[PDB]
Amino acid sequence: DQVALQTAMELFWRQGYEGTSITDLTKALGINPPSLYAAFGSKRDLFEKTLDRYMCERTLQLEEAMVRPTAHEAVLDFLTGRVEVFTGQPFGCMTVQAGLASPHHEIVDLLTAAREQMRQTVLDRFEKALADGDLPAGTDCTALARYVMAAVYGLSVEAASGAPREELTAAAILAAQVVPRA
Amino acid sequence: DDQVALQTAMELFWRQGYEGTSITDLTKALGINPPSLYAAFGSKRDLFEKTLDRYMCERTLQLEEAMVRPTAHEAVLDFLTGRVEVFTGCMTVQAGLASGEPHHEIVDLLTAAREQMRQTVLDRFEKALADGDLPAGTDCTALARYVMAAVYGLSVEAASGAPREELTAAAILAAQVVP
Numbered sequence A: 001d002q003v004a005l006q007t008a009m010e011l012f013w014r015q016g017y018e019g020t021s022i023t024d025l026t027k028a029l030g031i032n033p034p035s036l037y038a039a040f041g042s043k044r045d046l047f048e049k050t051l052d053r054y055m056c057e058r059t060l061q062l063e064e065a066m067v068r069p070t071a072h073e074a075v076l077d078f079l080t081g082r083v084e085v086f087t088g089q090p091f092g093c094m095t096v097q098a099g100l101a102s103p104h105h106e107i108v109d110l111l112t113a114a115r116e117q118m119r120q121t122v123l124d125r126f127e128k129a130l131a132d133g134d135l136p137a138g139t140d141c142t143a144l145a146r147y148v149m150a151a152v153y154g155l156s157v158e159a160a161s162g163a164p165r166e167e168l169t170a171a172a173i174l175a176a177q178v179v180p181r182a
Numbered sequence B: 001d002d003q004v005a006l007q008t009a010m011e012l013f014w015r016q017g018y019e020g021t022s023i024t025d026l027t028k029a030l031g032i033n034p035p036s037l038y039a040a041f042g043s044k045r046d047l048f049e050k051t052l053d054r055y056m057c058e059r060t061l062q063l064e065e066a067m068v069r070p071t072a073h074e075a076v077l078d079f080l081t082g083r084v085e086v087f088t089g090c091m092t093v094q095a096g097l098a099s100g101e102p103h104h105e106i107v108d109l110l111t112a113a114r115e116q117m118r119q120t121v122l123d124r125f126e127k128a129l130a131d132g133d134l135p136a137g138t139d140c141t142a143l144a145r146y147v148m149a150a151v152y153g154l155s156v157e158a159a160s161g162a163p164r165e166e167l168t169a170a171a172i173l174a175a176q177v178v179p
């Protein structure tokens, strides 16, 4: 379910992956080890499902978005897809959470890596778009990557605060407009 | 310093809220005696206001000042760039993985501030749509939601360590969607 993933998130957030036991998860979830396995799989399966739910910078979805034929469509796809994932979840995504005053160091390391891989993946997309010519020459790619990152996290914050989904989707469509299509 | 004292104060207020927090709670959490608390921060009220001013993303006074610019675009532009000028980690959300449940006092306060900010931008847009600078058809509701996302996202980027010059450039880009 959905409270189950939140429960798993809090544990992994505080303890990290390595230091979270099956026994921690069964106790927190209130189900036995075979039922945890039947519902969520191995601890690793459960951890990857938790990251699907709470990570802005999820690799597979970013990569799937980058395959679109223009940088604009790539970013558009990505931003609207995130809005689907983000929508009522009150914590925001994990980077939003890590940015608050007062995560386990393993989780800090994970977010730090994921954020920079996202930035670089977007920059690689921008580099290809300049060669293909759908990004105008002289585009500040570094600035534009940072803006895309700001847009994702900002849409996460709005979702977390309870913004209506059609309104947030309209906002993501406006945000994508900043990535030009020449 | 005691940038950190205010961090610890914020943690206690987040949990207990204002009314149920005593000086005796604060002194035992900050590890400092009340005269010291009075010298450094003032009354419980002053300390509360100080801690809120440190950690709230919504800066209404500087927002309202930005709105007095004659175009919707210029208003947003000066608000966004101005916001980055301050940033260089606020309570962007009303829930904490680590911190536990926020007191209902804190939830209400954060909700009101968010809503004030949104209304202020939405008004300015509605003003601008009549005054002529926003094209009729413009979705002012979606456009205000976008501005909120930009301001909080730039806030998250800044909190995560983004370089100043990149963030300023990102703000200027973000202002471009207000026609």
Ligand SMILES: O=[N+]([O-])c1ccc(O)cc1
Binding pocket: A115, B160, B161, B162, B163
């Ligand atoms: O310097 N950079 O390019 C950065 C710095 C910090 C950060 O969180 C992301 C990117």
